[PDB]
């Protein structure tokens, strides 16, 4: 009964033309340890920001899900930093993920919008 | 970043002379999915079978959700285990075993060598 599944969150700051954006790529089944590894970089990225200025891209194309603890870490990060994001582009596949993006958008102050194409997402995002 | 750590639980019935025990090996950082893969096997074993052996030499720990599944399993089934040999290394794992022993109705004892453990286990 063993398993060696690939998972994690990649975080970076990317560029599209003359705009910088915060990029995430969530892969596999996320754990609390994954949120822990990513949190200091996120805190570094948002240092000094107290207004809705940030735009982010979150690629969930290879995301399987979140552990229970990870789901709580995620909500904690949203409660703590979410107001600082004005727009969030979600990149995934299918209508069920589109629907989940619309549900997230209802809950959040920043504008969340779903895409399948990165170039479309970046055009809207920045 | 990315990772692909090995984790899981091996379970099965084993022999020591003309005598049997339930063997567990806990590897890595255990998750809820690991507990769900393992539970139906544990139940079939208990319907068919008590003393057990738990190898923690390669155990890192349990996720929050898994610690809960684990406690749920101990509350349901631990009374059925009269003796539990914990196979591990070091005094921190021994201490953890002694703490577990205090909490539980069966006798839990720490060993470094499987052969020494099986002599006491059955
Ligand atoms: Cl977790
Ligand atoms: Cl879990
Ligand atoms: Na929103
Ligand atoms: Na005990």
Residue numbers in the entry:
A (entry chain A): 0 to 125
B (entry chain B): 0 to 48, 53 to 125
What do the authors report?
The crystal structures of the proteins encoded by the YP_749275.1 and YP_001095227.1 genes from Shewanella frigidimarina and S. loihica, respectively, have been determined at 1.8 and 2.25 Å resolution, respectively. These proteins are members of a novel family of bacterial proteins that adopt the α/β SpoIIAA-like fold found in STAS and CRAL-TRIO domains.
An ortholog with 54% sequence identity from S. loihica (YP_001095227.1) is also of unknown function, with a molecular weight of 14 105 Da (residues 1–125) and a calculated isoelectric point of 4.9. Similarly, the structure of YP_001095227.1 consists of a protein dimer (residues 0–125 for chain A and residues 0–48 and 53–125 for chain B), two sodium ions, two chloride ions, nine 2-methyl-2,4-pentanediol molecules and 95 water molecules in the asymmetric unit. In the ‘open’ conformation (YP_001095227.1), these helices are 15 Å apart, leading to the creation of a deep nonpolar cavity. An analysis using the CastP server reveals a deep cavity (1743 Å3) lined by over 20 residues that are all hydrophobic, except for Asp73, which is hydrogen bonded to Tyr34. The floor of the cavity is formed by the β-sheet and helix α1. This large hydrophobic cavity represents a potential ligand-binding pocket that is occupied in the crystal structure by three 2-methyl-2,4-pentanediol (MPD) molecules, which are likely to stabilize the ‘open’ conformation by partially filling the cavity. Conversely, in the ‘open’ state, Trp71 is solvent-exposed and may participate in protein–membrane interactions, whereas His6 and His31 form stabilizing hydrogen bonds with Asp33 and Asp72, respectively. The dimerization mode of the ‘open’ structure, YP_001095227.1, is different and comparatively weaker. The presence of a deep cavity in YP_001095227.1 is similar to the eukaryotic Sec14-like proteins, which also adopt the same SpoIIAA-like fold. Calculations using the PPM method show that the ‘open’ conformation of YP_001095227.1 can associate with the lipid bilayer by immersing its exposed nonpolar residues from α2 and α3 into the lipid acyl-chain region.
